[PDB]
Amino acid sequence: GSNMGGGMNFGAFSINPAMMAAAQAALQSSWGMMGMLASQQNQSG
Amino acid sequence: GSNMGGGMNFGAFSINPAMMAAAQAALQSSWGMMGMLASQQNQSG
Amino acid sequence: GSNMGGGMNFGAFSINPAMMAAAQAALQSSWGMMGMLASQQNQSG
Amino acid sequence: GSNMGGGMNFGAFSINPAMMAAAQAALQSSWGMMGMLASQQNQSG
Amino acid sequence: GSNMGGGMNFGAFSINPAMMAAAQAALQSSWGMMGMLASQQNQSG
Amino acid sequence: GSNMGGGMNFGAFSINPAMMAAAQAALQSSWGMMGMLASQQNQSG
Amino acid sequence: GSNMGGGMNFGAFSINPAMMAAAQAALQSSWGMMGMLASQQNQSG
Amino acid sequence: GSNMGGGMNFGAFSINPAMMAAAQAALQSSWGMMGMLASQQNQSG
Amino acid sequence: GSNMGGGMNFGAFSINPAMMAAAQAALQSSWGMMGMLASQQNQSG
Amino acid sequence: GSNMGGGMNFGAFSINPAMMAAAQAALQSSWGMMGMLASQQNQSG
Amino acid sequence: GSNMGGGMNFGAFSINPAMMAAAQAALQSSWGMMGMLASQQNQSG
Amino acid sequence: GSNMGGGMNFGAFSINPAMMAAAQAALQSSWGMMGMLASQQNQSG
Amino acid sequence: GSNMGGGMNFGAFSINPAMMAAAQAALQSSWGMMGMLASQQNQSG
Amino acid sequence: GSNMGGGMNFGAFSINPAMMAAAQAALQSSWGMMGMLASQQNQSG
Amino acid sequence: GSNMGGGMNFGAFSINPAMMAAAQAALQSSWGMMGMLASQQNQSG
Amino acid sequence: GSNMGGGMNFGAFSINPAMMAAAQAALQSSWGMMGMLASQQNQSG
Amino acid sequence: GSNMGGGMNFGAFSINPAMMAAAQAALQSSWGMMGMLASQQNQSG
Amino acid sequence: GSNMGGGMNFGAFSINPAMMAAAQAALQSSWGMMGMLASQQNQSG
């Protein structure tokens, strides 16, 4: 169980990610102030 | 069970992601202030 | 069970994602202030 | 069971996603202030 | 169980990541002020 | 169980990572003020 | 004559008082955003 | 004549008082964002 | 005549007082963002 | 006549007082961001 | 007439007073960011 | 007439007073960022 | 062609202009939250 | 063509201009949160 | 073409201009949070 | 073409200009948080 | 083309200019947190 | 083209300019945290 502390940002975040994912399995996520992503990908051989 | 603290942002976030995903499995998500995505992708071989 | 804290944003978010997903399985989502997406995609081989 | 905190946004969100999804399975969603999407797509091989 | 302390940022973060991931398994994530990602990927040989 | 202390940054962080990962297993993450990523990848031979 | 300044609260107040008063004289009051109570109780001996 | 300045709270106050008063004279009050209580209790001996 | 300056709080106050008062005279008050209480209790001997 | 200057708090105050007062005269008060209490208690012997 | 200067606190105050007062005269007060208490208690012998 | 200068604290004050006062006259006060208490107690013999 | 950005005010504006204009040409305007006045006055000599 | 950025004010503006204009040409304007005035006055000699 | 950045003010602006203009040409303007005034006055001799 | 960066002020600006302009050409402007004034005055001799 | 960087002020600016301009050409401007004034005055002899 | 770096001031600026300008051409400007003034005045002889 992870634990994190609260934070307030009044500043001007500018994020410019650009992505291109091609794989047997691929996931892409982009977010701003807050987010929570749990992605388990099991590929059997 | 994850735990996260609350946060207030008064600043001007500018996010410019751009995406293009082509894979056997592919997922794409983009969001702003808040979000929660649980994606488990199991591809058997 | 995930846990997240509340947040108030008075600032001007500008998100400009652009997407194009072509895969055996593909999902696309885009959202603003709040959202919750649970996508499990199991592709058997 | 996910848990999320409430948030009030008085700011001017501008989201400009643009999408084009062509795959064996494809889903597309776009939303503004709030939303909840549960999409499980199982494609047997 | 991880433990983290709260932090307030009033400064102007500018992040410019750019990504391109192609592998047997691939995941991509980008975020701004806060986030929590738990991705376990087990690929059997 | 890790323990970390809280920190407030008023300064202008400018991060310019650029990435390109292609491996049997690959993960990519980029973030700004705060984040927590637990990625265990076990590839059997 | 008391003087007070106006205040606007957009946040989520949660008050959980619980009371049990038994005395020769007893008064109980509970209120939310605004209120004004003038209670003078003179018990002669 | 008291003088007070106005204040705006956007944050999430959580007050959890719990009370139990038994005395020759007893008064109990609980309130949230604003209030004004003038209670003079004179008990002669 | 008291004089006070105005203040704005965007942070998450958490007050957890708990009380139990039993005396010849007793008063109890609990409040959140703002309040003004003038209680004069004269008990003659 | 007292004079005080205005103050803005964006931080997370956590106050945990706990009280129990039993005396010939007793008063109890607890408050958060702002307050003004004038209590004169004269007990003649 | 007292004079005080204004102050802004963005940090996380944590106050944990705990009290128990039993005397011929007793007063108890606890407060957070701001407050003003004038208590004159004259007990004649 | 006292004179004081203004001060801004961004740091994490942690105060842990604990009190227990029993006397012919007793007063107890605890506060955080700002406060002003004028208590004159005259006990004639 | 002028360009201006949108703004939301929740605060208590108090404007107390007072005017008295006597000239060969004279115009007087007073307004609150929003307004747009284009007055061209050409007086030939 | 002028360009301006948007701004949100939650604070208590108090403007107390007072005016008295007597000239061959005279214009007077007073406004609060927002406004746009284009006044060209050409007086030939 | 001028360019300006957006700004949010939560503080208590108090402006007390007072004016009195008497000239061959005279203009007077007073404003609060935002405004844009283009006044070209050409007086030929 | 001028370029300016955005700024957020939470502090209490107090401006007390006072003006009195009498000239062949005269302009007077007073403003608070933001403004943009382009005044070209050409007086031929 | 001028270039300027963004700045955030949480402190209490107190400006007390006072002006009185009488000339063949005269302009007066006073402002607080932000402003942009382009005044070209050409007086031919 | 001038270039300037961003700066954040949390301190209490107190500026007390006082002006009185009488000349063939005269301009007066006073400002607080930020400003940009381009005044070219060409007086032919």
Instruction: Say yes or no: I5 contacts chain N, CB-CB below 8 A.
Output: no
Residue C8 DSSP code: -
I17 touches chain A (CB under 8 A): no
Nearest to G36 by CA among I25, I1, H16, H39: H39
Name residue D43's beta-bridge partners.
C43
Q and P touch per CB criterion (3+ pairs under 8 A): yes
Cβ-Cβ pairs closer than 8 A, P with R, add up to 13
Whole-number Cα distances in Å, F7 to A6, E9, H4, K12: 11, 9, 34, 11
H22/J contact by beta carbon, under 8 A: no
CB distance B10 to I11 below 8 Å:
no
Residue K6 in contact with partner chain P when CB distance is under 8 A: yes
M2 touches chain O (CB under 8 A): yes
CA dist., res. A28 & res. Q18, Å (int) = 59
**H or E stretch covering P9:** none
What is the distance, to the nearest Å, from the Cα of residue A3 to the centroid of all Cα atoms in its chain? 17
Q: What CA–CA distance (Å, rounded) separates M9 from M4?
A: 15
Gap between the Cα atoms of L41 and K42, Å rounded: 5
Number of Cβ atoms within 10 Å of the Cβ of Q1: 9
Q: Closest Cα of chain K to P14: distance in Å? A: 14
Cβ-Cβ contacts under 8 Å, H13 against chain J: 32
Distances (CA, A) of L26 to J18, J27, J28, J44, L21: 17, 11, 13, 16, 6
Find, in chain A, the residue whose alpha carbon is nearest to that of B4: A4
Q: How many alpha carbons lie under 13 Å from residue I35 in its C-beta half-sphere?
A: 31
Asked if P7 is an interface residue toward chain K (Cβ–Cβ < 8 A), one would say no
Structure tokens at L37: 């208490």
Beginning with the edge strand found earlier in the chain, give each strand of the sheet holding M25-30 in spatial order: M25-30, N25-30, O25-30, P25-30, Q25-30, R25-30
Selection from R12, N17, E37 nearest residue A4 by Cα: E37
Cβ-defined contact of N13 to P26 (cutoff 8 Å): no
* Cα–Cα distance, O37 to Q36 (Å, whole number): 11
Residue indicated by tokens 């998450």: I12
Query: How many angstroms separate the most distant Cα atoms in chain F?
Result: 48
Q: Distance between CA P4 and CA R33 in Å, rounded?
A: 13
* Chains H and G make contact, 3+ CB pairs within 8 Å: yes
Nearest to E43 among F16, F25, F39 (CB): F25
Alpha helices in C1-45 (DSSP H): none
Distances (CA, A) of N45 to A3, L20, N37, O7, R42: 77, 86, 25, 43, 20
Tokens of J25: 């005269």
- Distance between CA L13 and CA L34 in Å, rounded? 12
Q: Which residues of C touch A16 (CB under 8 A)?
A: none
Resolution of this entry in Å?
A: 3.9
d(CA C2, CA D3): 6
Q: Rounded to an integer, what distance in angstroms lies between the CA atom of residue L11 and that of residue N19?
A: 46
- The 3-state secondary structure of chain N, one letter per residue: CCCCCCCCECCCCEECCCCCCCCCEEEEEECCCCCEECCCCCECC
Distance from C-alpha of P10 to C-alpha of O11, rounded to nearest angstrom: 4
A32 interface with C at CB cutoff 8 Å: yes
Report how far residue P13's alpha carbon sits from residue O7's, in angstroms, rounded to the nearest whole number: 14
From chain K, the residues in CB contact with P10 under 8 A are 8
Rg (CA), chain M: 15
Neighbors of chain K with 3 or more C-beta pairs under 8 Å: F, I, J, L, P
**Residues D29, B37 contacting (CB under 8 angstroms):** no
Other CB atoms within a 10 A radius of the CB of residue N44 amount to 12
- Report which secondary-structure segment, H or E, holds R29: strand R25-30
Using what technique was this structure determined?
Answer: cryo-EM
Q: What is the DSSP letter of C33?
A: S
Which of K26, K30, K44 shows the shortest C-beta gap to I17? K30
Q: How far apart are CA B37 and CA F5, in angstroms?
A: 28
Tokens of P24: 């062949």
What does residue I15 show for φ and ψ, rounded to 5 degrees? -110, 135
According to DSSP, the residues that pair with M30 across neighbouring strands are N30
N and K adjacent (3 or more CB pairs under 8 angstroms): no
Q: Choose among F23, F25, F29: nearest CA to F43.
A: F25
Question: Across the interface, do J4 and L36 touch by the CB < 8 Å criterion?
Answer: yes
Answer whether E6 touches J (CB < 8 Å): yes
Q: Which residues pair with J29 in a beta bridge?
A: I29, K29
On the CB side of A43, CA atoms within 13 Å amount to: 19
Nearest to D4 by CA among P15, M16, G42, B31: B31
Using the CB atoms, write b or e for H6-40: b if 16+ within 10 Å.
bbbbbbbbbbbbbbbbbbbbbbbbbbbbbbbbbbe
How far is it, in rounded angstroms, from Cα C17 to Cα B16?
6
Q: How many CA atoms lie within 13 A of M41 on its CB side?
A: 18
Strands lying side by side in the sheet with A36-37: D36-37, C36-37, B36-37, A36-37, E36-37, F36-37
Nearest CA in chain D to C23: D23
Sheet architecture: strand order including N14-15 = M14-15, N14-15, O14-15, P14-15, Q14-15, R14-15
Alpha-carbon dihedral angle through residues Q29, Q30, Q36, Q40, given to the nearest 10 degrees: 20
B33 is written with which tokens? 């202030």
Chain H / chain J CB contacts < 8 angstroms = 13
Residue N4 is encoded by which pair of tokens? Answer: 């301006």
CB of M16 within 8 A of CB of G14?
no
- Pair of tokens at residue B11: 């600043």
Q: Is M9 on the interface with O (CB under 8 A)?
A: yes
CB atoms within 10 A of CB R39: 15
Rounded CA-CA distance B19/B21 in Å is: 7
Alpha helices in chain F (DSSP H): none
| P38, R40, Q36, R25 alpha-carbon torsion, rounded to 10° | -80
CA Rg, chain D, in Å?
15
Residues G37/H29, Cβ–Cβ less than 8 Å? yes
By the CB < 8 Å criterion, does J32 face chain L? no
- In angstroms, rounded to a whole number, what is the distance separating the alpha carbons of residues P39 and F26? 60
Tell me the CA distances in angstroms from F26 to C21, E45, G8, one per residue in order: 20, 15, 50
Which secondary-structure segment (H or E) carries K36? strand K36-37
Q: Determine R/G contact with 3+ CB pairs under 8 A as the test.
A: no
Retrieve residue I27's tokens. 């008063």
What are the E-state strand segments in H1-45? 14-15, 25-30, 36-37
> Which chain M residue has the Cα nearest residue N36?
M36
The residue type of R33 is M
Cα O32 → chain centroid:
9
P contacts of R36 (beta carbons < 8 Å): 2, 4
* Cα nearest neighbour of P10 on chain B: B10
Query: I33 vs G2: CB contact, 8 Å cut-off?
Result: no
Q: Find out whether J25 and I21 touch, Cβ atoms under 8 Å.
A: no
Tell me whether residues D7 and B36 touch, CB distance under 8 A: no
Q: CB neighbours (10 Å) of residue Q20? A: 18
Reduced to 3 states (helix: H, G, I; strand: E, B; else coil), residue F4 is: coil
Chain G, chain H: beta-carbon pairs less than 8 Å apart: 165
Contact L36 J7 (CB under 8 A): no
Distance CA A34, CA B5 (A): 10
Q: Do B10 and P6 touch (CB under 8 A)?
A: no
